[PDB]
Amino acid sequence: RKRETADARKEANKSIAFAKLNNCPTSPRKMRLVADLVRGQKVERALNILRFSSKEASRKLEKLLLSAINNWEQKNSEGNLEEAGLFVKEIRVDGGMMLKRLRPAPQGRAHRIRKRSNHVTIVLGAIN
Amino acid sequence: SKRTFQPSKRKRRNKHGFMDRMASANGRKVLARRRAKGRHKLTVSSEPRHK
Amino acid sequence: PRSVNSVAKRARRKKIMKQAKGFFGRRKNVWTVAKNAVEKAMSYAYRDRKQNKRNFRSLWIQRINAGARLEGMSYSQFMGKVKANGIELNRKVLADLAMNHPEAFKAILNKVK
Amino acid sequence: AHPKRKTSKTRRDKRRTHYKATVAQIATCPITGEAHLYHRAYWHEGKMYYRGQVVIDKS
Amino acid sequence: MRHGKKINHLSRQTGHRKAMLANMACSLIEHKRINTTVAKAKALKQFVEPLITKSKEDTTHNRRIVFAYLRSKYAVTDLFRDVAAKVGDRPGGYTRIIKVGNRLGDNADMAMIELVDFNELYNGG
RNA sequence: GAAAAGAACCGUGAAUAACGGAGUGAAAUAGAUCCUGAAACCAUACGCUUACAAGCGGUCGGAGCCCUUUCGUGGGGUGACG
RNA sequence: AUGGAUAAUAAUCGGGCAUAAGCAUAUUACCGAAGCUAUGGAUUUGCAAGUUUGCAAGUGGUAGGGGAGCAUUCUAACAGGGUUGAAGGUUUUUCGUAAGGAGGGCUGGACUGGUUAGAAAAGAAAAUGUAGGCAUAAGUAACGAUAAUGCGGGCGAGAAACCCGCACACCGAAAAACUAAGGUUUCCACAGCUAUGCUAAUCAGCUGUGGGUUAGUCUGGUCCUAAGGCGAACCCGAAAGGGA
RNA sequence: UUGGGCUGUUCGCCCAUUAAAGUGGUACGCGAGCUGGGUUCAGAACGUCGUGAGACAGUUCGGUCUCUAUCUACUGCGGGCG
Known part of the structure; x- marks a missing residue:
């Protein structure tokens, strides 16, 4: 196949509004806890939940949603924002490249400690 | 407790120094072996002194 | 020359693992667990083929017995009077008649009785 | 003691069903419209509103 | 079983607890509103x-009694004056x-313990 | 990457963290963790089942429900029950 | 048929249960295996026709023995394919006794391979096998002396840990000051929170930039010597070398 | 269905009571429940055997008892659904 044709056909992101957060120094199992409370909610209920969540994994997740809202506003320039009624269509928390360090355990041995990362992706979608 | 390595930068040179390796006939073969292998660091005398 | 069977080494196990499709847990993707499960599945499939031929005959016999006990008879007496009459109809056809064509089954019964 | 069998991804997924988080009790004040935690005060703009009134005026 | 223990140790010794309770009172007296945790405020x-x-x-006996608790003349005078x-x-x-x-x-619930007669903007209802 | 032409500039963001655009290219899902990039492993969406039922988890029978169809005693998925 | 004691987690015709569905003899029908037969197909020896067919006897299998073959890498000849898309990866269809062959869609963007003959670094599921990557235990143990913290201001997007101030507490023949051994820039100022700090950090013995060590009298050499080392000459020992 | 003296003791004898001070099994129940008093670790000494190194169903003094509970089995407490 012609790669330029395949790329021009796959470049259909001119409509979907999404946001990504790569290389976040936080574990994925602890952000998947707060992603479940946001998945499917409205774009303002999700903001309130992330702002009042008692988790350190929400301080940097509440602004990824704002960046997604801004990307939606950029893509749909002709039109307001409150009439559309945005929500959170899909949100996925994946793994990332982890760092490996050593901790000296008793009796002359060493244990491994993996500082994990995670990737977050969010798409909004509209009700209209 | 007390460990096995108690450093001394004169007891080290009096035992592993260049002039201690070059004084013996069989200690002079260590230099030949290390130069043949290609060791960037020869006897402990290669460590830089305090300046 | 150096010969490495790298491509076919995995192309051979892909075909054996593609038939472990639907297995619970790691029996469908892990190689040394799928291979141990596909061979046992084929061993189970070799047999049960001799048992499918004797588990259906039991069902046919039960259905013939049920259809014959509706006319005040038993399977043993019915089969005796059928075999010693020159009929030669297998239990598959006899059960199909007893289930779908009760008129034909009772006609056979009245003819052999 | 030591585990004798590796915990399957089914047995460890049926166990992480009460490990979910808890959404906080969020309320809204019909004075300034800002959202806050129920039974808690909040800073809107240099002030602290609790129950329709103002507690601190740091503007 | 603590069926009647109406006192909170605040995870501190018998001396540290009283020292902290006497140190917070001087602050609450010199500044009419302080920000603490919920249990410490209660x-x-x-x-x-x-x-x-x-x-x-204002008697010479009550002044000494309050001093035995506050342990600071700067808080005693500021409690008895205004x-x-x-x-x-x-x-x-x-x-x-x-x-x-x-x-x-540490995600601890906070509180804003204040004096009632020094806050003229809030009533409650 | 053939050649740095290695992303000027704009927006969210405290941020020269990251991302979404805009330009380079034949390709940016070739963006410097950079040729193609599998398996283990970790997740999301959709279709079928599952809260009275005991064991190498499969095999032989078997409804029901979803897709496709040269139209079929054709194909694919899940499968109550034995 | 009846009486002749029984063992320790709850028991037994396998169970329901049966007065025949128990026992003894006789008869008939039926069920009952990968046994035998009926149908289709494949293969090994022996016998004939030829250049595969017909008949007969077979065709469980460990140690072990024999015969036909597949894939992989490369080479020699002839004949090819590919940027109008090669190898590789992912799905699907079909063919063969099997190892395997061929075709289609998607990614991929430069090599590949048919026939005959040849060679071998020629095939993994196990060796408490090796290297790399990733799970489980699990968000569990732990976060390293039970001397202790509280509040108010400052920078700051962000402060339980940073700076300032007021309180509290601990050591004090010490947890105070000098300094030897040793370390060899960790010292001081400004920017930074990426990695390092068992947490965050606006902080740092961390990162990057600019600085910092001044001797006639202090410690060593230029002065001396102990234990010990080297040692012309001399004495020994295959050599190297030993004694002195 | 008792408490003590002796012994590492099981056993056994004795003392004072009681209605009685049962016989046994459960890896001579139970050490991921406890102790290590005895026995089979390295030291030392006695009697005896062996020329000797050394040994004894002979005796005496001293001598490190590891592990964060996965599945099932128990004792308690909850959520979901019917």
Whole structure:
């Protein structure tokens, strides 16, 4: 196949509004806890939940949603924002490249400690 | 407790120094072996002194 | 020359693992667990083929017995009077008649009785 | 003691069903419209509103 | 079993607890509103209510009694000079506690323990 | 990457963290963790089942429900029950 | 048929249960295996026709023995394919006794391979096998002396840990000051929170930039010598070398 | 269906009571429940055997008892659904 044709056909992101957060120094199992409370909610209920969540994994997740809202506003320039009624269509928390360090355990041995990362992706979608 | 390595930068040179390796006939073969292998660091005398 | 069977080494196990499709847990993707499960599945499939031929005959016999006990008879007496009459109809056809064509089954019964 | 069998991804997924988080009790004040935690005060703009009134005026 | 233990140790020794309760009262007296945790504020309330109650009569014995609790002349004089004059003839409850959210380091519930007679903007209802 | 032409500039964001655009290219899902990039492993969406039922988890029978169809005693998925 | 004691987690015709559905003899029908037969197909020896067919006897299998073959890498000849898309990866269809062959869609963007003959670094599921990557235990143990912290201001987007101030507490023949051994820039100022700090950090013995060590009298050499080392000459020992 | 003296003791004898001070099994129940007093670790000494190194169903003094509970089995407490 012609790669330029395949790329021009796959470049259909001119409509979907999404946001990504790569290389976040936080574990994925602890952000998947707060992603479940946001998945499917409205774009303002999700903001309130992330702002009042008692988790350190929400301080940097509440602004990824704002960046997604801004990307939606950029893509749909002709039109307001409150009439559309945005929500959170899909949100996925994946793994990332982890760092490996050593901790000296008793009796002359060493244990491994993996500082994990995670990737977050969010798409909004509209009700209209 | 007390460990096995108690450093001394004169007891080290009096035992592993260049002039201690070059004084013996069989200690002079260590230099030949290390130069043949290609060791960037020869006897402990290669460590830089305090300046 | 150096010969490495790298491509076919995995192309051979892909075909054996593609038939472990639907297995619970790691029996469908892990190689040394799928291979141990596909061979046992084929061993189970070799047999049960001799048992499918004797588990259906039991069902046919039960259905013939049920259809014959509706006319005040038993399977043993019915089969005796059928075999010693020159009929030669297998239990598959006899059960199909007893289930779908009760008129034909009772006609056979009245003819052999 | 030591585990004798590796915990399957089914047995460890049926166990992480009460490990979910808890959404906080969020309320809204019909004075300034800002959202806050129920039974808690909040800073809107240099002030602290609790129950329709103002507690601190740091503007 | 603690069926009647109406006292909070606050995870501190018998001396450290009293030292902290005497150190927070001086702060609450010199600044009429301080920001603490919820349990520490609820304990400071029960520790500081009888002191302000005794402060409503300036006698040489009550001054020494309040000094034995506060352990600072700067707080004793500031409790007997203007705090007592501004409390007036209140029946009780000279302090109020209002939660202001949670902290960040350890996620502890906070509170804004304040004096009632020094806040002229808030009433309650 | 053939050649740095290695992303000027704009927006969210405290941020020269990251991302979404805009330009380079034949390709940016070739963006410097950079040729193609599998398996283990970790997740999301959709279709079928599952809270009275005991064991190498499969095999032989078997409804029901979803897709496709040269139209079929054709194909694919899940499968109550034995 | 009846009486002749029984063992320790709850028991037994396998169970329901049966007065025949128990026992003894006789008869008939039926069920009952990968046994035998009926149908289709494949293969090994022996016998004939030829250049595969017909008949007969077979065709469980460990140690072990024999015969036909597949894939992989490369080479020699002839004949090819590919940027109008090669190898590789992912799905699907079909063919063969099997190892395997061929075709289609998607990614991929430069090599590949048919026939005959040849060679071998020629095939993994196990060796408490090796290297790399990733799970489980699990968000569990732990976060390293039970001397202790509280509040108010400052920078700051962000403060339980940073700076300032007021309180509290601990050591004090010490947890105070000098300094040897040793370390060899960790010292001081400004920017930074990426990695390092068992947490965050606006902080740092961390990162990057600019600085910092001044001797006639202090410690060593230029002065001396002990234990010990080297040692012309001399004495020994295959050599190297030993004694002195 | 008792408490003590002796012994590492099981056993056994004795003392004082009681209605009685049962016989046994459960890896001579139970050490991821406890102790290590005895026995089979390295030291030392006695009697005896062996020329000797050394040994004894002979005796005496001293001598490190590891593990964060996965599945099932128990004692308690909850959520979901019917």
